[model samples]
Structure formats: structure tokens, C-alpha cells
Target: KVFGRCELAAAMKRHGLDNYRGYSLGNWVCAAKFESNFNTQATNRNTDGSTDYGILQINSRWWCNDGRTPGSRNLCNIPCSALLSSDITASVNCAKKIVSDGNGMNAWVAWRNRCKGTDVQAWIRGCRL
Candidate 1:
């Protein structure tokens, strides 16, 4: 499912992404927009044989066990398919873990280039969160 900007922000806030790990909720919303266009079923294959899955594009190489990534660490201990669900709970929780790490929001290239060190508050402008 693709979400509207404010719609996605409101949903993500309900999932506890606001100011999580010092990263603003808007940053997350921005990442989702650029990474997957807020589409729950989005996916992209990396040149390195790994696949990125779901809203935030979590990678099969480290975050999920796709059964195809050669050396998947499965850091999130979830099947890659879990990230594809519109429910978003698994992806949200896994993203929390990712942000808590030292890399923080830098884990997603979209966030780094499009959201980080910038003003993303516009992402949630009309969202009542």
C-alpha cells in the first residue's frame, strides 16, 4: 500500500518512531518516501546479490534472512518477506534497532541524502502527531 505524506507520518508515529534514537519522525517519513514511495511491497536488488525489501528497504544481507543472500546475518531475525507486509510492525521494529545502532538513520541511503542534516519537518506538516 502506498501512503500519503501525512498519512504515513501519522502511522509511523503510532508505531513509536517519533524522536526515536534522536532521529525525528519526519526523517523516517522522508526515508520511506524516497526508499519505497511508501509502498509496502517495494523491493530492489542490490548489485552485490543482496535484496532490499519493504517500506524502508531493509536489506536481506544483514537485516533479514531471505534464504538467498549468501551470508545473511538476519540481524532482525525475521524472514525478508515479513518486511513486505503492509502491517509494518516488523519493519518498524527492525528500523528501531537499526537506528539505535551507531549508524542511526545513516543506515538508509535515502535518509542520509534526502533527510539527514536537513529539515524534514515538512514530512509531517499536516499530521496531527
Candidate 2:
């Protein structure tokens, strides 16, 4: 695990993630809560055989190459393992690119299923950041 609500918000703010690609920090934090519970090392093997990686739970099919998985587009040009690190720079950058690519936060099923159209301000309610 990497952060509590406040720590995550502060880090995201420091990285200028309060508003990236026009998505609010609350949206991203909400997505993270459902996707990985703020755990940087989190990963999930999808039923389709692809995997989700890191804090954003990025899919291996288009984001990163895991070596064991073939046919990865690796659009982020990063190794899948890199996203698993506690350092979230690559994860955030790649997530930004994903949002810019037209899907917005809808790329994350957690966002679509849990955060979309919901009031998410509580995701960053404390720590004064």
C-alpha cells in the first residue's frame, strides 16, 4: 500500500494531478481507491489473460510489456514492472496519456463503475491540500 487519502492527495497535488487532462483529483483518487486501494504494487490478472498494473491498474494489452504477455502495444514505452514501483511517476504519466487518448477516466472500469457521475470530493477531504 502507498497512501492514505490525504497522502495520496498531497502527492497528486505535488505532481500537478489536481487537474490532469481536465479530470479532477477527486476522480483519480476515487478510481485509485476502487482499483487498488492506493497500493502501488497492486496488479490484477484479468479473465481475458491480460493484466492490470500499478496504482492506476493499467492494462497490459496497451500500456506496458510484461514479457510473459505477448502482443502488447506498450504505448507508454515502459516495462510493466516499472508501474509496480512505489514511485508513481510513470504510472501517472501513462495514465495522463490514456486520458488524453480520448477515453478519459472511463478507461478505468473502476472509474466508470464507481466514480462516474458521483460526488467524489470526499476522496480529498482532509490534510488541507
Candidate 3:
């Protein structure tokens, strides 16, 4: 499920994420670009010994279950593998719930280190969404 940036942006916007949780669409676009490059199957092991999953890289420690991992909060009540799909509704829903937990986009290190304080508009550049 690798998507062109604009295609990803369009799909996310259409999913009602243009201004989700007070964050602009560009913020989501920027985060997604750096975190997973819009690949639904993306996964990474963090230095903290947790795994990040899917397009937005939701973590296994708190948001979703990684099956073998214990002590996960599983706040989203979904499997980590569920995030790794071409249909993005589950990921989008899980992301909104994560943001609503008061962490916001700061939950994503990529957003903090890369997308934050930058010209995020470029993430959506040339997208007609």
C-alpha cells in the first residue's frame, strides 16, 4: 500500500482528517511522509523496545496489541497488524484517539523532530485535496 504523497493526502483528507483534533491536514501529511512514507505495511522497532506500525506508525506499547508483547494498554483495542492495511479507516480512527489522549502529534517523534516548526505546507504541495 505504497501511495504517492498527493494520493495519500487526498485519501486522508477525504477521511475527515483535514482538521482533525485541531491539527491541520499538512501536519498529518508531514508526519505520515516521514514516519512511514504512506506505506500501510511499514513497521519499525523503536529504541525504547517497542514497535511502531502502519502509515502513522502507531505504537504497540499503548495503542495496539502486538500479540507477543505484554503490558500493552491496547487503547485502540485493535491488533497492530490491523493498522497495516490499504484501507486506512482503522489507522485514521486509531490516530484520532491517540491525539485525543492529550499527547496530540507529539506522540510521533517524527512529527516532533521533522514536521514540527517546519513548512509543513510542502507536504501537501501539488495535492488537489
Model 1, 1-129: lDDT tens digits are: 888888888888999999898778889999999999999999999999999999999999889999998967999999999999979899999999888878888889998888887888888887777
Instruction: Summarize candidate 3's per-residue lDDT along 1-129 as a digit string, tens digits.
Output: 998899988999999888898888899988998999889999999777779999999999999998766777899999999999999999999999988888788999999999999988888888787
> What TM-score would every model get versus the actual structure?
0.96, 0.95, 0.95
Residue 100, model 1, lDDT: 83
- Each model's total of backbone clashes: 0, 0, 0
Q: Which candidate ranks first by TM-score, i.e. highest?
A: 1
Residue-by-residue lDDT tens digits, candidate 2, 1-129:
578888888877787788888878899899989999999999999887889999989999998999867776999999999999887888888888898888788899999999999988878876688
Q: Rate the local accuracy (lDDT) of all candidates.
A: 0.90, 0.88, 0.91
| Residue pairs in clash, model 2 | none
Q: Clashing residue pairs in candidate 3, if any?
A: none
Instruction: Give the total clashing residue pairs for model 1.
Output: 0
Give me the displacement of residue 76 in model 1, in angstroms. 0.7
lDDT of 3: 0.91
Residue 27 displacement (Å), model 1: 0.5
Greater-lDDT candidate between 2 and 3: 3
Lowest summed lDDT across 10 adjacent residues in model 2 is found at 120-129
